[PDB]
Symmetry: C3
Subunit: 114 residues, 3 copies
Amino acid sequence: PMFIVNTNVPRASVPDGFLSELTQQLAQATGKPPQYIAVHVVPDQLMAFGGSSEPCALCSLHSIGKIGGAQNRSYSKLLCGLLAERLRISPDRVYINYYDMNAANVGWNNSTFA
Amino acid sequence: PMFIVNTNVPRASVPDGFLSELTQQLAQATGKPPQYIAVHVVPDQLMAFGGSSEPCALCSLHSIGKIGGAQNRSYSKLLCGLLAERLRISPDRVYINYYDMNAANVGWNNSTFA
Amino acid sequence: PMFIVNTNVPRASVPDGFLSELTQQLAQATGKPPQYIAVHVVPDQLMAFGGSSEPCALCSLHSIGKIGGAQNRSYSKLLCGLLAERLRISPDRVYINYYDMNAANVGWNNSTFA
């Protein structure tokens, strides 16, 4: 799985250990070894949510499997919770796009997962 | 809806009221309350279009519905128009990827839109 | 086609000519005319792969067609090869998401490719 967070929160407000915490929590939430988890945090972004420059985040979670209605609700609770606790972003100022990828459409290590 | 623009145009060339203008214009164009519109502009990017590094832009518009053949042509005229007028990017150096997201695949406020 | 690389490798380690090489090699691999190829490289990123902050990359290739099982395997070999040779990123620390875009969902030059 791959999780990307784009936010207007400044770099200095991203706490030490955040990428590792996201890796660990996503590994547990998806039921997959942490070796498969990639995380990417992009602070200091020029963005608005609802026309407001208050803290917000635009995120993506891509995975081969483990994406669906109930699972995505659970991921959203987990991830909004982390963004609220660690970056002080209100959950109603977060969008997370979920992508259920086919193995043939994910490249890695000179090939794909198909 | 969420609109992202990545561009090699420098940050100082992004007009002060650009995020607010994108928000209002996309609210009108999608027929959604502006409270739901997220906008994200990423200047100063290392990019090329056709092998050339004159001003260009790579963009995306994600929405739950309001995506389709004629609608996307209208969005493209609207958004290329704004990028040409405000950022001085030629319309033939802009790509906009459109994504019709299922509500169950969009997280927000600790849950999804399903 | 549009190819985006997001990497923790620093900007100074991206060689002169990298965008031009990606453009030409993507034209060679997809067969598409170079004038239609966009490339975007984002260095200095806060990211982890498998819990580790060693050099890594998260990438995407979007194309109207020219996406599929065998094609994506070939692109992964090519692109991991370039990332290894030019950015010193191990291929097993690269993910590439492949997207076959419908022409009606790609805006360009005030319209779409439909």
